[PDB]
Scaffold this motif. Structure first.
Motif, PDB file in Angstrom:
ATOM      1  N   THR A 265     -15.644  11.641  15.266  1.00  0.00           N
ATOM      2  CA  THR A 265     -15.124  11.307  16.596  1.00  0.00           C
ATOM      3  C   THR A 265     -13.876  12.147  16.921  1.00  0.00           C
ATOM      4  O   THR A 265     -12.849  12.048  16.244  1.00  0.00           O
ATOM      5  N   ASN A 266     -13.997  12.981  17.957  1.00  0.00           N
ATOM      6  CA  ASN A 266     -12.866  13.698  18.571  1.00  0.00           C
ATOM      7  C   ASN A 266     -12.276  12.857  19.711  1.00  0.00           C
ATOM      8  O   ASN A 266     -11.140  13.090  20.149  1.00  0.00           O
ATOM      9  N   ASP A 267     -13.058  11.870  20.185  1.00  0.00           N
ATOM     10  CA  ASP A 267     -12.678  11.013  21.310  1.00  0.00           C
ATOM     11  C   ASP A 267     -11.589  10.029  20.869  1.00  0.00           C
ATOM     12  O   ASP A 267     -11.855   9.104  20.106  1.00  0.00           O
ATOM     13  N   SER A 268     -10.362  10.263  21.347  1.00  0.00           N
ATOM     14  CA  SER A 268      -9.174   9.485  20.967  1.00  0.00           C
ATOM     15  C   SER A 268      -9.336   7.977  21.259  1.00  0.00           C
ATOM     16  O   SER A 268      -8.859   7.148  20.496  1.00  0.00           O
ATOM     17  N   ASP A 269     -10.068   7.655  22.334  1.00  0.00           N
ATOM     18  CA  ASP A 269     -10.304   6.268  22.789  1.00  0.00           C
ATOM     19  C   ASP A 269     -11.255   5.536  21.825  1.00  0.00           C
ATOM     20  O   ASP A 269     -11.066   4.357  21.513  1.00  0.00           O
TER      21      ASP A 269
ATOM     22  N   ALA B 239     -17.897  23.906  25.101  1.00  0.00           N
ATOM     23  CA  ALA B 239     -16.455  23.618  25.119  1.00  0.00           C
ATOM     24  C   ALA B 239     -15.720  24.519  24.102  1.00  0.00           C
ATOM     25  O   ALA B 239     -15.934  24.405  22.890  1.00  0.00           O
ATOM     26  N   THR B 240     -14.894  25.440  24.616  1.00  0.00           N
ATOM     27  CA  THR B 240     -14.065  26.356  23.802  1.00  0.00           C
ATOM     28  C   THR B 240     -12.759  25.642  23.346  1.00  0.00           C
ATOM     29  O   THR B 240     -12.024  26.126  22.476  1.00  0.00           O
ATOM     30  N   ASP B 241     -12.511  24.460  23.932  1.00  0.00           N
ATOM     31  CA  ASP B 241     -11.339  23.613  23.627  1.00  0.00           C
ATOM     32  C   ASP B 241     -11.650  22.619  22.467  1.00  0.00           C
ATOM     33  O   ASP B 241     -12.772  22.622  21.939  1.00  0.00           O
ATOM     34  N   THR B 242     -10.615  21.825  22.070  1.00  0.00           N
ATOM     35  CA  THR B 242     -10.670  20.697  21.097  1.00  0.00           C
ATOM     36  C   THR B 242     -10.285  21.151  19.664  1.00  0.00           C
ATOM     37  O   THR B 242     -10.001  20.315  18.803  1.00  0.00           O
ATOM     38  N   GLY B 243     -10.226  22.477  19.430  1.00  0.00           N
ATOM     39  CA  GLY B 243      -9.879  23.040  18.112  1.00  0.00           C
ATOM     40  C   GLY B 243      -8.426  22.798  17.699  1.00  0.00           C
ATOM     41  O   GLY B 243      -8.143  22.528  16.520  1.00  0.00           O
ATOM     42  N   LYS B 244      -7.496  22.907  18.671  1.00  0.00           N
ATOM     43  CA  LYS B 244      -6.061  22.637  18.436  1.00  0.00           C
ATOM     44  C   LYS B 244      -5.806  21.128  18.264  1.00  0.00           C
ATOM     45  O   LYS B 244      -5.136  20.711  17.313  1.00  0.00           O
ATOM     46  N   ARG B 245      -6.354  20.317  19.198  1.00  0.00           N
ATOM     47  CA  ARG B 245      -6.192  18.846  19.178  1.00  0.00           C
ATOM     48  C   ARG B 245      -6.778  18.248  17.896  1.00  0.00           C
ATOM     49  O   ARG B 245      -6.272  17.241  17.411  1.00  0.00           O
ATOM     50  N   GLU B 246      -7.820  18.912  17.348  1.00  0.00           N
ATOM     51  CA  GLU B 246      -8.478  18.482  16.107  1.00  0.00           C
ATOM     52  C   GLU B 246      -7.480  18.405  14.942  1.00  0.00           C
ATOM     53  O   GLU B 246      -7.549  17.483  14.145  1.00  0.00           O
TER      54      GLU B 246
END
Length: 99
Positions: A52-56, A11-18
């Motif tokens: 945890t990166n998982d918002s839920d 996964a190249t994503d999740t860096g901005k949302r982090e």
């Protein structure tokens, strides 16, 4: 569509949302540290909140430490009343006229 794809699933994503998550994680760990949780429980929740990166699952961690703290305020209140109103035990006369 896709499933658990056996390979080099990176996964190249999740860096901005982090970045957005980090502020939220600071908030949660602050509340966890401010609440009457045990030393181990504070560290226990903080670890999950950071990992945890998982918002839920972060929403779940809120539900969890708020529950733990609630259970603590109920349990500890009864233990305070135990000593504070220990008139049928070797204790000073704190004759707390209250229920």
């Amino acid at each position: 569509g896709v499933e658990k794809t056996a390979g080099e699933t990176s996964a190249t994503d999740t860096g901005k949302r982090e970045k957005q998550l980090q502020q939220w994680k600071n908030n949660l760990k602050n509340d966890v540290d401010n609440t009457i949780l045990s030393h181990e429980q504070k560290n226990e929740f903080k670890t999950k909140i950071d990992e945890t990166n998982d918002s839920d699952a972060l929403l779940e961690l809120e539900n969890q430490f708020n529950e733990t703290n609630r259970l603590l305020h109920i349990k500890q209140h009864e233990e305070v009343e135990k000593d504070k109103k220990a008139k049928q035990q070797k204790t000073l006369k704190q004759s707390d006229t209250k229920v």
